[PDB]
Amino acid sequence: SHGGFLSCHLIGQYPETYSACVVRNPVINIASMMGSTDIPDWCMVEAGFSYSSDCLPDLSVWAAMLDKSPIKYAPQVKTPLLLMLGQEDRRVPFKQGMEYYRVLKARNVPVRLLLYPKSTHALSEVEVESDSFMNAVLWLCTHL
Amino acid sequence: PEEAAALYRGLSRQPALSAACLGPEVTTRYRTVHTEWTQRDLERMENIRFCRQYLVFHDDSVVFAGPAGNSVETRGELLSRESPSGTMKAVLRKAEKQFLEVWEKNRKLKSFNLSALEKHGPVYEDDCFGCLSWSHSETHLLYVADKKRPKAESFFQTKAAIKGDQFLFYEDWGENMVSKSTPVLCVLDIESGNISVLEGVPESVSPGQAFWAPGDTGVVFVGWWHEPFRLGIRFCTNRRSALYYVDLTGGKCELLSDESVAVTSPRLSPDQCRIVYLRFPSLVPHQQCGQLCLYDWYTRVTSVVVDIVPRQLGEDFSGIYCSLLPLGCWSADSQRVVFDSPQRSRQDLFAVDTQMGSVTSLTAGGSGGSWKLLTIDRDLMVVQFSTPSVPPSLKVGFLPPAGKEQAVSWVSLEEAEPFPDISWSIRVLQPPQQEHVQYAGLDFEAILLQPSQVPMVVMPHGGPHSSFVTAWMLFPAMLCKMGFAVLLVNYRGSTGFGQDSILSLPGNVGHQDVKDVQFAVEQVLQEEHFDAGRVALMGGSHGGFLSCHLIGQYPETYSACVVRNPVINIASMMGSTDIPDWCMVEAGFSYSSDCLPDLSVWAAMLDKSPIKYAPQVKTPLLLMLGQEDRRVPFKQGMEYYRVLKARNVPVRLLLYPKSTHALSEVEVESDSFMNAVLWLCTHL
Amino acid sequence: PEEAAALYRGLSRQPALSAACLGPEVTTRYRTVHTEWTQRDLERMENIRFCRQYLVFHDDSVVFAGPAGNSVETRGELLSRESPSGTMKAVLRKAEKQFLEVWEKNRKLKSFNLSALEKHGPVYEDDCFGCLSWSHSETHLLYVADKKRPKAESFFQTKAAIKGDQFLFYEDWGENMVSKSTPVLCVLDIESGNISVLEGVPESVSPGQAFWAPGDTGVVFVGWWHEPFRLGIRFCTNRRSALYYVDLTGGKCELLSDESVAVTSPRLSPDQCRIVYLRFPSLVPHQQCGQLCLYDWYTRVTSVVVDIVPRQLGEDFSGIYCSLLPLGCWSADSQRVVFDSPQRSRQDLFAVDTQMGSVTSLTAGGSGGSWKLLTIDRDLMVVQFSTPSVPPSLKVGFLPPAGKEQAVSWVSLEEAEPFPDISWSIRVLQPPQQEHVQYAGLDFEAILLQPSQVPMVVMPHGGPHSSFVTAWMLFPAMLCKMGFAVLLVNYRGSTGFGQDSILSLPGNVGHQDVKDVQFAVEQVLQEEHFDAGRVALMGGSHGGFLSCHLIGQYPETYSACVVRNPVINIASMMGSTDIPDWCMVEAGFSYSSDCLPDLSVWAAMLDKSPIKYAPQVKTPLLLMLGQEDRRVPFKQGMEYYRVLKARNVPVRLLLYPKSTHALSEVEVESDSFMNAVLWLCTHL
Amino acid sequence: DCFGCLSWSHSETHLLYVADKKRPKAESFFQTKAAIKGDQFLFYEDWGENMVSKSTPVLCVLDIESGNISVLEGVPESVSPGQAFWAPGDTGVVFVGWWHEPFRLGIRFCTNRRSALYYVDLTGGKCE
Ligand SMILES: CC(=O)N[C@@H](C)[C@H](C)O
Ligand SMILES: CC(=O)N[C@@H](C)[C@H](C)O
Ligand SMILES: CC(=O)N[C@@H](C)[C@H](C)O
């Protein structure tokens, strides 16, 4: 989640310091996230603007959320990545990981994706959790 | 609510044609024509498909024609194709599993269980990739089916395969193509019963629309490029593609057309010496005017039989706008091709010579109407004719020799009773300031329906590279029967008006078509003298986008609005859809796969979106959304709904948990239409 | 096992006719004939039903005939009936629920949901009671459906009806009629859409076979008596019944025939002035020779057009043995009736005049074959012809005027390729001592199939009041193809040999037919010079009872035996069968509802049971039983098996958990047949 | 855990819990009949993440002796109640009310939603 947001920021801004990365349901674009989520106030508060129910964001607000997003550092990533997404996630929509995956695939960077059709923001199902943990451990053992 | 329900029940009774074919000629001479029809059953809430047979006695003249039995309903049939000689018939049946059966005479010769053979995935039943072609030797069959994914198992499995790859990701072809990643060509031998997959298709290409080469030596197909992404393919004819030929044995592959432009709909002449297809020059708009290209099998040469008409090539032709050519389109002489294309605000049939290059309109003249060609075999043409005031009817004609094509006589196999309470007309409108510099002098049209103090309903088409034609439309007809004058607007950028009209729209979506619709409404109100107090809007998809723009920029001109799956924010839409290039092209920027938009691009899409005018809306609104829509995500309507609800504006919302971009389900369509009619009747 | 499977697959491919109808006459004159066929699909393990249409051009002569399309499979249709004028068509569709649809031209006019109206139970799809008749004014429909049982609830029900009657007992009509207690007549008005149940049927009578009276004033039906018990009705034509007429309004009821004899199959003349039905004089045997009775609607008089033939009325007639007359059986002149009846060891078509009383055989002479009449309209007859060496074929003929009926010419619409590797013949046998005193001079027949050191298979028919006819039988044909000579025996007591032959059998079942079968086998072995070392037996129901007797009474004459649902003890069967009368009659006693069998009765039944010879059986026996057989309790076979097993006699038992007395399910029939062949082959 | 509650009465004779409200029955326009027509596919907003099909809860009180179930009639219209418990003396119910006007923001992992503490009498619908 937010840890994935920080991990993407770290692998983007410091490319030659890490050898692997595993992220589950990350946040990639705040501006695109605001339109499709159940907590639109989270994006406004984290960006730095007060949230108003009867309001429409201006161009400066969108510019701020675009500048703070990790996708801005996408064309500098050079570390293998593994993503786990929940197709029924409603807090962080699953398209956020897919746009990052598309950007990384366009530049020919090794990326692995696993999509769970019935999971949620927590990945709390026994089978889902077991499979995700085993895949992450094998990925880390193989690359490191 | 009882009168509206009765009217809908009455108007949904009329059937619609789906396909046609011609049987072998029997010397007593006469022929049999097989027609397939579809209808809506409201008691069962389903789409019933049935079949019927007709007999035509011919001497190059239609001596006699009549029915030859009753209608028998068929269930479970996906694909069918009669034999080239008419002896046999191959059918695909979805009995959970899939079966391929070969009927001959009055007995089922053999049926094959495709699933239990464990060689491929489920077959393709769509029109973009689905194909079933008999061999020229009548001994083999060919079709397209999904590839076989290796079996996967969990890490912790009790055992008396790849472990961990259970939940891998497989990308599909966007809208209405769920779980369709990579198709493959399969060939079945009827005698032995074996199934073999071809081994010459390039890795980065998905094949389709295959047919057997002359001599049964190879397979000719159309390949679509899916590297690095899989863009949406429904309602889009700008995807990179090519024409390929692959030998049955050895895996040899050869290229037959250019690799930097879309090519589609290839057909083979009865003489088995030439191929004709459609080529699209540009890739920016999702629907444009193509050119008819011809390829010689022996001489190995290519030519352009028809070209792109800039504005209009004569008073009868405006360009080729059909996505798929008919399954049978050649003539007996193997020198002429008959197709059906839109023209202005109607649809017509055209015949094109592959040597001279002239195009002649067979249905030219008259007051209007829509004609559709179903098949042509041995110079016998089967045609469906529809008009806004009469349900579709069936007709059979004979193609006269070259130079006298316009003198064609029709025989009515099946005629439907018309509705004499609907009068329709076509109005031509010239824009004022509003005209651009590169493209000047263009005019658009609008169809007006009135009964034969009158409220009006304005309907713009989606697309925006689509068009309205004078055919049988259920909803406008029932609205006119209720007492509403209906105006369907074909603004600048529609199809059937030349390539310049299509090319003018991109880069100006939001400030040019809205003005065109408003001007059409104002001119019609001034001329026809209707009731200006009660005027309503009702648009679907892109039309909803235009309707929201209209109700935002002109608040005191309308009294109601009904929108289904509208587009509200382009910038937010770009991130979650299967066609990201649509937003970039409509905004005015070239689409690049390896690119990230800047702040100026986001500012442009924000300025062109209708949400910018949200705090000025003062008209009641009704929204219909599909929770499983993948072309226009359903959050787009919900953000507009939230903005309108915050300002305390009366809004009604209906969400269908299993619908799609089309709302094509019988129950969904019935409920949505009834709700819209009640809303319009109550508010107006 | 591969060769036998391939042979069965090849021989099961041939289709079989099910029904036929004739369309309206069109003046160009020509007519359309609709044929329905059934086939066995082994890949899906189901029975596929499809339809086909033919065209016949007539000038009272068949000028031309040929096919008019392909075959389309239909699923979910239970009952159908074309309109009397041919304009419309009513269909019953089992889409969980039941629908009644009215098709006209190329569109479904209206469909009614029968279940949601909550007026009656499920409709009847059988042939004994099922009926669907259009009104003479073409505005109403009539059918038969189960009665409505009042709702019941448990004593302890959580509530936000009768309590305690949840598990009440409702008696059904024996075999193959589960959950069918009391039917009722329902009339549906197409215009309004209402459904009304008639209110004149007597309480102690179940109605059926209804049709509209002349003038659309009332309904004429056949009523069956079910007081105090409900005896089995399948394969039985001796149940008390009568002919009743009930007015639509007022509930008036009238009787038209005698109330102390079975009457069935009433038909109405095209002139709408007379009715013809079949009357059965005796009630003892389950199948006998009836008489054709005629009733005048205006004069209110009754007469006997045909009577019971004691031995033989000429060299071409032996009596009427058909349970149901064809749906269309009258002629245009409304003075002649055409039916199909067995005669000796074949089946023929007969025409009977209702004024003179003479019966003429249209298919008289020739070498053999089986003819079946499907329909006759406007003196045009549709006929199915089958022979043991050729699958059934379709034919169309014209009925010549009176006095020259034997000069009828046929036109072959559809002909099936024959099998030239099978030769069949008919043998006549005269019994020795073995002849009774009351009935002397009777002779029986046997059909012999041989290829065109040979083992033989002997097959007696069930019934025992049934018969074998020279028609297309799958199992004897495949056995002959394997290399087995097949002998089908029609012992004394079969049908098609006069009333005396039928009446001789009762009271002597167990010591007379066994000797007849043994004599036939001995004579055939002596004459044809086959291999006496290898001779097998195979039979079902009564045939199984006979087979068991033979292998016990004659120990060293057979080398194997395959029985199916056999009768092993009549005494025990009496209390566990739906037809307890059969046991009493066959044993030689008069069945009485109010009677408890004495010791004498029991003794007789046990002495005729084949279990009294069990200690001597030494032939390997293959037993196939249907767990849900309600005609012959499956426990019968079990008791025989136990005895033989205890005495160490090779017995293999294959119990089907859902099969009935017929074991007709494709999955059961395919396995049973296959297993049988292997068994016989191995031992022989 | 946000709204679920089950509290015994102080007199040990009643029970109280929270359950979803009752939506009026709806039917299609074309229904075969031997209710509101057209409102079948109306929209009901839920409480965001992991709370699918949970729009407006209500307080229910069950009497063990008689077996009747009664819904309280004092909760304000624009407030969803929860975390209820019996007041001292078994005279009323004290609960926490969350505001859902005009939107329903997500509530899982969030503790900044506007709310208040309310007291409602069993009979009369008095609210404080
Ligand atoms: C409050 C929230 O949105 N959290 C997601 C970003 C992550 C599960 O942390
Ligand atoms: C191509 C596309 O996205 N169309 C939607 C906006 C609408 C169904 O028109
Ligand atoms: C009349 C009848 O069904 N009898 C049984 C014994 C058998 C099926 O023959």
Numbering used by the authors:
A (entry chain D): 587 to 730
B (entry chain C), C (entry chain A): 10 to 37, 42 to 72, 74 to 109, 117 to 181, 200 to 471, 473 to 492, 499 to 730
D (entry chain D): 148 to 181, 200 to 293
Quote the original article:
Acylpeptide hydrolase (APEH) or acylaminoacyl‐peptidase (AAP) is a serine hydrolase that regulates protein metabolism. It can also bind to and process unusual substrates, acting as a detoxifier. The most prominent physiological function of APEH is the removal of N‐acetylated amino acids from the N‐terminus of oligopeptides and proteins (Perrier et al., 2005) thereby exerting crucial control over the proteasomal degradation of damaged and misfolded proteins (Adibekian et al., 2011; Hoernstein et al., 2023; Hwang et al., 2010; Palmieri et al., 2011; Sandomenico et al., 2021; Shimizu et al., 2003; Shimizu et al., 2004; Tangri et al., 2021). The S9 serine protease subfamily, the so‐called oligopeptidases, employs a further, size‐based selection process (Kobayashi & Smith, 1987). Their active site is sequestered in an inner pocket that is formed between the catalytic hydrolase domain and a propeller domain that caps it.
Here we determined the tetrameric structure of pAPEH in complex with acetyl‐alanyl‐chloromethyl ketone (AcACMK), a covalent inhibitor using cryo‐EM with a maximum resolution of 3.19 Å. The AcACMK inhibitor hydrolyzed into acetyl‐alanyl‐methyl‐hemiketal (AcAMHK) and bound covalently to the active Ser587 and His707 of each monomer of the tetrameric pAPEH structure. The oxygen of the tetrahedral center (most likely an OH group in the stable form of the complex) is oriented by the oxyanion site—the backbone amides of Gly509 and His588—similarly to what is expected during catalysis, however, neither distance (3.9 and 3.6 Å, respectively) is close enough for the formation of a proper H‐bond. The amide NH moiety of AcAMHK points toward carbonyl oxygen of Gly509, which is—again—similar to those seen in substrate complexes of serine protease enzymes, but here it not quite close enough (3.8 Å) for a strong interaction. The acetyl group of AcAMHK is coordinated by the Nε‐atom of Arg677, which flips to fulfill this interaction (as compared to its position in the ligand‐free form of the enzyme). The small Ala sidechain of the inhibitor sits in the shallow, rather hydrophobic S1 binding pocket. Furthermore, the loop holding the catalytic His707 also shifts closer to the inhibitor by 0.5 Å, as measured at His707(Cα). Since in this case a covalent bond is established both toward the catalytic Ser and the catalytic His, both the His‐loop and the oxyanion‐loop move closer to the inhibitor (and each other), tightening all three dimensions of the active site. It seems as if the too spacious active site of the ligand‐free form would attempt to move closer to activate the enzyme sufficiently for binding the inhibitor, but the resultant active site pocket still seems quite a bit looser than in the case of the canonical binding mode.
